[PDB]
Amino acid sequence: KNSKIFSPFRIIGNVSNGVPFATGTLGSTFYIVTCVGKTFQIYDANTLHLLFVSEKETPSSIVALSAHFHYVYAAYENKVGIYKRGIEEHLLELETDANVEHLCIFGDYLCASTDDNSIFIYKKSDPQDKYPSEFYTKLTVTEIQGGEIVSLQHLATYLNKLTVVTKSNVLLFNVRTGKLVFTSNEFPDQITTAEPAPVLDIIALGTVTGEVIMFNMRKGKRIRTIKIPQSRISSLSFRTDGSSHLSVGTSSGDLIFYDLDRRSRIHVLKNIHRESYGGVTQATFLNGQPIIVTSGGDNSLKEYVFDPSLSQGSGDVVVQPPRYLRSRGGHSQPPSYIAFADSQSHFMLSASKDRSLWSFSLRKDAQSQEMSQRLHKKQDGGRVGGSTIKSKFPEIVALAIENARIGEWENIITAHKDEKFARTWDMRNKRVGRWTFDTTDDGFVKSVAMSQCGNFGFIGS
Amino acid sequence: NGTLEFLNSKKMTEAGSLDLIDDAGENSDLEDRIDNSLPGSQRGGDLSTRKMRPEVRVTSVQFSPTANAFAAASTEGL
Amino acid sequence: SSLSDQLAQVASNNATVALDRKRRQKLHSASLIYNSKTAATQDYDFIFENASKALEELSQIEPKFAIFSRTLFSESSISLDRNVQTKEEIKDLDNAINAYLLLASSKWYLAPTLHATEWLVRRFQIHVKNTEMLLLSTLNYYQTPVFKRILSIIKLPPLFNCLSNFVRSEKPPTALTMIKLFNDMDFLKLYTSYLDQCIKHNATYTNQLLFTTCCFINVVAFNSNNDEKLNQLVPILLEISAKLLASKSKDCQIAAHTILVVFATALPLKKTIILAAMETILSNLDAKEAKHSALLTICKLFQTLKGQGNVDQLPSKIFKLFDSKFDTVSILTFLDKEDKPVCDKFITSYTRSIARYDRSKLNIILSLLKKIRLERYEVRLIITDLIYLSEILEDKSQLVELFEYFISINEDLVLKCLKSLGLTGXXXXXX
Amino acid sequence: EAAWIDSDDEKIKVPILVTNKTKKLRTSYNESKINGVHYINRLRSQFEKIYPRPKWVDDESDSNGDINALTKILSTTYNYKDTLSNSKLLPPKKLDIVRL
């Protein structure tokens, strides 16, 4: 499958795929590291600009992502990989044929967990090593200790202790000695997610039935049982600013915020990610700041801010609703048609099966836009048709653009599936134009074209 | 001057364009700090008298009589 | 950003520290009682001489102010300023002021109270620093001129921006502009914190609770069109009615009944939510004047919701709670009233729980059916459960007397449902 | 109190003055080798300084009628319209129509 003419560059237009991403503190700033299939990307927090991608693609899909201060740890099919700056700095091989599913890193002890209930421990050879490389031991969870390993977490102020959460119970492992030191009582529900807390010895467990069980690991007893009606829980995080906010993210596209001080709700964000692609897969607060970064399978990554309270004196009671901020995204579907918007190889127009049309950029990956399907007002003074509950245009199957006379009128004609008119789009304004071109013989359009002068557009019934 | 139809919006402050701000004083030397810019030096005799940046224009174009080419005298040269 | 917008943030922070004599003139002229010229030319001790006489008069009225003589109205509380003390003690000064205003929100129609709060305005700058709790305390007296005085002194927070045209206005704020204030989504949550702090400190009275009901009912009525807005407004007024029902007073129970009726009439709810509305009403109901209002509220709450299983059997926990908190004779004498409100869905849901749980007192439903006039489908569901009662219970002759009424009026209905379950001729053999 | 005791957490003798993140955990200046139980107690207090302790972890513990029944139901219910019944009576003042 090698070529002597072409060679792959990158995959333009992807942000996330649905794997739970990682974030890493780096001084004051933060980097949001996600993965797209056989590669992975690093996004800055304050601008959502792409910073680094993998120089060489992974042989298979990236299953688990974790990131320390500088070194991003990617976990594909059999091996975990320690990367810096996108460069493959070290490849750590797991001496088993099973697949790696979760990857925790704390201290000198890397913690790789395969799918067949085995936890690998990797030790730094030197105490001043920058990443673990030597192989310490192979912890095993049997069928009498619990179910499959849902997640690996390391709680704060535990000396060489690994917290393992199964589908039925929580275990602890003294990784220096490789010994179980504590087992939790059985949880009747199937635990789906885990997260540490700013309070000590506290881990938050979210189940498939909408229960947040908040397990104090010192006493071995739960504390707060937060109930969510019949929703699959996928994400859990805490706002570490100091205000007691728990963010729980359902897989049904909902994001629920709880005020743990007042034992009350705050806001239920609806449809921040689509249902069919997984919903809110991973959503976490930046550490100490009221900016929550959410991502899912819908190929998007949004940021939401908790504004400061309008009341000057009350504060904690009247809390502001979360408010949309920076977001980068792509099509939720594979893209059908692609054209080029200019001779400079700058902008690429892609119309997908997600009923949309994006103008990606090959030069700067943060320059991409979703071109607006907001109809212009009719010149006649008569109200246009269509539904009051607005939906997107049908899927575009043929496209044509002339770059000669741009910005003074419409320069894109797009042809949709099963529609009896083609639609105009202005590339400079990045907006659907004010003209539709009927075939006038009762026919769907199968081909469209422009003149090179740009004044004339041709429509094929 | 005229290379762009769309100027950037991070250059207008609440008063004055950022690149129109006379930044000759921050230089460490003397001869380029000296401003002899006349007020009406539109297409003058020097460039230190301009007080602006030069504007782009082409002013004389001829086809080559031999080799299917054409030369245009530009601000950038020829 | 720019420069001057950051300066207004500094100016709003330092609007209480006096820098020049002009700034002292424009801060000491804030006056609840005196005019502008008399306020500028009087000393702190002269205000405190009237203040000590004011709080001594208030300690005669209620002795809860005897604490505030030694913490806020001491002679040592003159030299100290809010803008010389650090952040760990200005929070203690804030809630001490908030504790005083809650204990003095009722006492405002008396000139001793206005003289007492005048020195708290001047010495502790409460017309700039904590303007919210001052304005919430006097909000029910908006017709009175002391609210027009308070608006002429105060600087408005961003949440009470609807009263921005009523500062220094010769006409008082009206009823329509108070609802436009309460229509804000965030302000309802802030009044919830004010009301929850009002109930917790056990100083809730008639006039502020009459006014709070008069605005809570209107804000549902003004939002009756937008169904999305009333969905957003459900967790506030139900949590208020949860806290108002938890109060042991004679006034908060009736005020919670007023909120719970009109909200459900303007918005049908899930059955389990209105089932929880029964148990919270039925829990701490002991006031004699509130027992009649509670029976009419449960009556109205049952006919609000519509659907299958609307008039089904109650849980046994709720039924025995209703049996203890309401005698069967008491609800019969309630039905004796010739006004006779619409209790149709509640009664047929009450007697199905009677036929299921106690299975002993069927003389009440003989008196219940003779008193009330019931609709068609509710009678069918009563007879169907009494037919099921005829199968399992060791049938006494009062069950035959109950079906004797059922064949005395609308005998086709009992005959039709007997054809649905069993044989028509088998009824006499089984009873 | 304690639901588990790590037997191999007392014999450990970590150094403290070798990394700048742990150099704020010393209390004297002539201590460098500190055993684990003192070290994990010191590191707990340093973590309490970095992240504070909010009041809900301590003040709340879940462990004939009731008064918090409305509060309990409002926590467990997220949609409040009686529309899942299909009540066979149309809601007044609003109409749900579809045009074909």
Add this chain to the structure above:
Amino acid sequence: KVENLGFVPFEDLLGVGHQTGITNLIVPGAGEANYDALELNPFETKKQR
């Protein structure tokens, strides 16, 4: 990169001039707490000035 630094003469703050604006770091004991009203008044009205 700081440009200059100057103390408030009768309070205790140093004003450090950086590239992105102005900060005032608090110090305990820079300024003198007993100013002379016949030379320099922080609280000076118009007619006194």
Add this chain to the structure above:
Amino acid sequence: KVQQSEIKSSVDVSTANKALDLSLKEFGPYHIKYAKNGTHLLITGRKGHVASMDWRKGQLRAELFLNETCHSATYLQNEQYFAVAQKKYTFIYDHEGTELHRLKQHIEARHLDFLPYHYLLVTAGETGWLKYHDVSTGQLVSELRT
């Protein structure tokens, strides 16, 4: 090791609010000259910004956008009259931001200072000369060639 984040918690709210952290991103490194009494502040943007700042209260006496590279500005006798230093000449302003004089001398002023009991404006810049100027009479008193 004591930091400004925990000083502000343990310091009274008068000087806590006086800890003014501005943010003027769009211009150069700002030069600060307080008045001789701590009541007014003067910023000198390296690109264009001079604001006759009233500091303890939030008022702003004069905002000026001077497109030449301003270097150093100072209040001279009160909070009213202040003098900035441009690319080539030293200007002198009032409380309203109006020009008062264009000083024909002080032909470079990188560092401009004032000493109050003589009404003496001093200037010495990239030129070697130090020029003494009297703001009370307008007579350039001395011109020292260093």
Add this chain to the structure above:
RNA sequence: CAUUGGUGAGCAGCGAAGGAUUUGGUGGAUUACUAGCUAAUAGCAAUCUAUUUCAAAGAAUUCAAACUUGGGGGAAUGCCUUGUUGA
């Protein structure tokens, strides 16, 4: 009669559980994306201090500089330059 003038009453037509204006705030682009800080071949990011001092290096216009003056006329007191007493 034209109105190529304004103000109002309607109709034809356009017309999927509203539609027109007008406006505040925020976010993303408006040049082509290799991450924060520091004393930087490394460390920090929960810190650089009970490790940051010594040593080494480091001095010409032999004692150098307004290349930056609106013009005319002077310049008493100034200032500059060159000649005139005593260590």
